[PDB]
Amino acid sequence: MDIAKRCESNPLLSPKDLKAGINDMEITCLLNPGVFKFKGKTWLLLRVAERPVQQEGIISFPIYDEQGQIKVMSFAENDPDLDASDPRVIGYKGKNYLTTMSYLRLVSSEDGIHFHDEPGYPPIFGKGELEAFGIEDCRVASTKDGFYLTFTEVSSVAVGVGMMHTNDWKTFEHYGMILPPHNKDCALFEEKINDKYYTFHRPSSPELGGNYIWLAESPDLRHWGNHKCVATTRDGFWDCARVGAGAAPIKTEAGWLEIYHGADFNHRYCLGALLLDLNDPSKVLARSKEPIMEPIASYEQTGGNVIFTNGQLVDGDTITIYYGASDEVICKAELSVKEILNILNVGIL
Amino acid sequence: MDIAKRCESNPLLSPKDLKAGINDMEITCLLNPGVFKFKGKTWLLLRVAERPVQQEGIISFPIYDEQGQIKVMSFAENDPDLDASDPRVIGYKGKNYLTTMSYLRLVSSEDGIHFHDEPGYPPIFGKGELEAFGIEDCRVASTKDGFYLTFTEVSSVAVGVGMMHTNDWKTFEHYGMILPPHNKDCALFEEKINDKYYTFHRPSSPELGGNYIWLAESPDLRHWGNHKCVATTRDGFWDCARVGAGAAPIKTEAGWLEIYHGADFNHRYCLGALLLDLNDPSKVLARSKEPIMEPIASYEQTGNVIFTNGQLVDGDTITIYYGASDEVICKAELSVKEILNILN
Ligand SMILES: O=P(O)(O)O[C@H]1O[C@H](CO)[C@@H](O)[C@H](O)[C@@H]1O
Numbered sequence: 001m002d003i004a005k006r007c008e009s010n011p012l013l014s015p016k017d018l019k020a021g022i023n024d025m026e027i028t029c030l031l032n033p034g035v036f037k038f039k040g041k042t043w044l045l046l047r048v049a050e051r052p053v054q055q056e057g058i059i060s061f062p063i064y065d066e067q068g069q070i071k072v073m074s075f076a077e078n079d080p081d082l083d084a085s086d087p088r089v090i091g092y093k094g095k096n097y098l099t100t101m102s103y104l105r106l107v108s109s110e111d112g113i114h115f116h117d118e119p120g121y122p123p124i125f126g127k128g129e130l131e132a133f134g135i136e137d138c139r140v141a142s143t144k145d146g147f148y149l150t151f152t153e154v155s156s157v158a159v160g161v162g163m164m165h166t167n168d169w170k171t172f173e174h175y176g177m178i179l180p181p182h183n184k185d186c187a188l189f190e191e192k193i194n195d196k197y198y199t200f201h202r203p204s205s206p207e208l209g210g211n212y213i214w215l216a217e218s219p220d221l222r223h224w225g226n227h228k229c230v231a232t233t234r235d236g237f238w239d240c241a242r243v244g245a246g247a248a249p250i251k252t253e254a255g256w257l258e259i260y261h262g263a264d265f266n267h268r269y270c271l272g273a274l275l276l277d278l279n280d281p282s283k284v285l286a287r288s289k290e291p292i293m294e295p296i297a298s299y300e301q302t303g304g305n306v307i308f309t310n311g312q313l314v315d316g317d318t319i320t321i322y323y324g325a326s327d328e329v330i331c332k333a334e335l336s337v338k339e340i341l342n343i344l345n346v347g348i349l
Numbered sequence: 350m351d352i353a354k355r356c357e358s359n360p361l362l363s364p365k366d367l368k369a370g371i372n373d374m375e376i377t378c379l380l381n382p383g384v385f386k387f388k389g390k391t392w393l394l395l396r397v398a399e400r401p402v403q404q405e406g407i408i409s410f411p412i413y414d415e416q417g418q419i420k421v422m423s424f425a426e427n428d429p430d431l432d433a434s435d436p437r438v439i440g441y442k443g444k445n446y447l448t449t450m451s452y453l454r455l456v457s458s459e460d461g462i463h464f465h466d467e468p469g470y471p472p473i474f475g476k477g478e479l480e481a482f483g484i485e486d487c488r489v490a491s492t493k494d495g496f497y498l499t500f501t502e503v504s505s506v507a508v509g510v511g512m513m514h515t516n517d518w519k520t521f522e523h524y525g526m527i528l529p530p531h532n533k534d535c536a537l538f539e540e541k542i543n544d545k546y547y548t549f550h551r552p553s554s555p556e557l558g559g560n561y562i563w564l565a566e567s568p569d570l571r572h573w574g575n576h577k578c579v580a581t582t583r584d585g586f587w588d589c590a591r592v593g594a595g596a597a598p599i600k601t602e603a604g605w606l607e608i609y610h611g612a613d614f615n616h617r618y619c620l621g622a623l624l625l626d627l628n629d630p631s632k633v634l635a636r637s638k639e640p641i642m643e644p645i646a647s648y649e650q651t652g653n654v655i656f657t658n659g660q661l662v663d664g665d666t667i668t669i670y671y672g673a674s675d676e677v678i679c680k681a682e683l684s685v686k687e688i689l690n691i692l693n
Pocket residue numbers: 031032136137184185242243244263269306308324327
């Protein structure tokens with residue numbers, strides 16, 4: 001099944017490798033990095049999750065107050081108004097809170113393996129009401145007009161999608177919430193088709209639907225419409241519970257090649273391939289029957305049974321994905337375009 | 350709390366008053382009408398729900414066949430793979446079906462009271478994959494460029510929002526699904542602000558959120574962005590469970606006046622008032638503490654629901670049309686100045 005060539009140095013980055021970005025917090029997780037080239041280097045835009053030192057019998061976590069300043073909230077673990085069954089999202093008196101706060105952090109490399117913070121390139125932290133609980137899982141589209149970031153915006157009122165733009169990775173323009181709750185896994189295409197922009201996204205339905213891959217179009221990147229359902233989950237398959245796009249699709253001669261993630265009802269996450277028509281990206285030409293990558297390395301099963309990619313580089317036939325493993329550490333692997341197309345029974349020349 | 354002046358002829362229309370739009374089916378519900386003026390008359394754009402005659406031991410419901418024609422599907426009541434416990438949504442082998450299909454139906458009036466079908470003006474049925482389970486709860490914006498319809502699109506993959514445009518109520522242009530699932534209660538503003546279009550909407554969150562009133566902007570009506578949360582539910586209030594906009598807001602000197610609906614955890618629906626800033630409609634200037642209208646007439650409890658997504662305005666008098674008990678169509682008047690006074 002698995003056709004990924006893992007980097008021998010995996011994991012490349014773990015929580016212990018970096019100093020905490022938020023005063024008095026500690027890094028619990030590094031994951032789901034955006035990937036791009038800039039100034040001769042390979043860059044990761046890390047999702048970094050932080051929280052305070054946990055005292056016994058007490059769950060403690062950061063929030064931004066109304067003034068955009070960091071504070072700490074805490075609950076007794078045995079509080080009868082607390083549901084802490086999920087370790088990511090807790091409930092207290094009918095309201096939801098995250099156990100950590102995520103922000104986006106830049107690291108660079110000259111070899112694609114050893115990464116470090118770069119002086120003059122500080123992190124991107126959540127701003128405003130709709131990002132009070134943090135920002136997550138940022139895709140980076142490298143385009144002729146610069147870099148477009150599409151990420152989860154989290155608050156007490158929404159899990160939604162934001163977009164920002166940069167040329168220099170120091171100043172940013174923010175386009176607001178482009179897609180309302182409940183939505184994430186937003187993969188902007190790096191070029192126009194038929195004079196429009198396109199993105200994959202992933203709305204969640206409480207009923208009459210599920211967690212499927214969708215398409216939307218835009219004339220301007222700020223405003224989105226003409227929504228289309230591209231690919232659902234598949235009953236009795238590895239991807240029966242939820243699907244979502246990763247990074248931007250790769251332009252091949254046979255179509256748009258999309259490395260998506262799918263999960264089963266055991267919360268095991270694997271990677272598959274979708275091939276969409278060049279001119280009509282809502283049209284599926286091919287889909288992996290089995291995964292092309294599964295969480296089978298030791299570091300892909302800790303703490304659990306998760307690989308997740310939302311960033312890659314492509315050089316000829318070689319795709320270099322960067323990925324989160326166990327929602328905790330950062331890893332690299334290579335895949336072959338032609339091998340994927342061959343396995344998919346797609347003709348190539 | 351209730352300050353509505355109900356029309357003495359309520360209900361204006363009940364299921365029995367109309368012949369079925371789909372041959373041999375029964376009208377179960379008339380509700381939640383769009384409202385507009387055209388060719389000197391008052392029109393309603395009804396939500397009509399139909400299903401076949403129910404036979405003993407058999408649950409039957411409408412489907413689109415492969416040829417896009419309305420037909421019937423049926424299951425034995427004692428089938429062990431059938432869950433027909435809910436009367437709105439049934440389950441069979443892990444797939445969901447609605448028990449009725451909704452479409453949009455035009456009726457007109459010369460007096461605002463007695464409505465009838467108009468020859469030459471047939472109904473609007475769902476078309477395409479994203480409307481396979483019907484269309485619902487259509488808001489009608491009357492604008493200088495004609496009429497814009499914003500309605501629920503329902504299918505097995507999504508409850509989302511569609512938009513159509515018409516000048517003559519015979520020919521329509523369809524702009525597709527403007528808002529993805531899970532969304533409805535889309536109230537398009539009838540004029541631009543700072544050279545953009547605005548709409549209220551109502552995404553539903555499985556967690557980290559709820560069912561709140563949201564705002565979006567557009568340069569072109571087809572494409573939407575810059576989403577903003579306008580008003581949440583209120584813990585301990587009549588509107589603790591869910592809120593949603595009705596029709597387009599009314600332009601007043603004090604701001605945009607929006608007659609919204611809100612529900613509690615007993616599924617009682619009432620109407621309230623929201624006042625938004627003229628230039629920044631995401632900004633709430635005032636909100637009714639109590640409802641301005643509650644389901645207290647007999648026909649509003651046959652269950653404890655009033656719902657409006659259409660109205661006319663003549664001076665200080667708002668004439669709302671509304672669904673009552675999710676079954677019948679009714680009319681009432683409200684005073685702009687009385688609402689604004691309450692809101693101080
Ligand atoms: O909604 P999705 O596409 O299933 O992804 C979610 O689960 C992943 C696995 O824990 C996480 O890595 C992601 O951050 C996200 O919370």
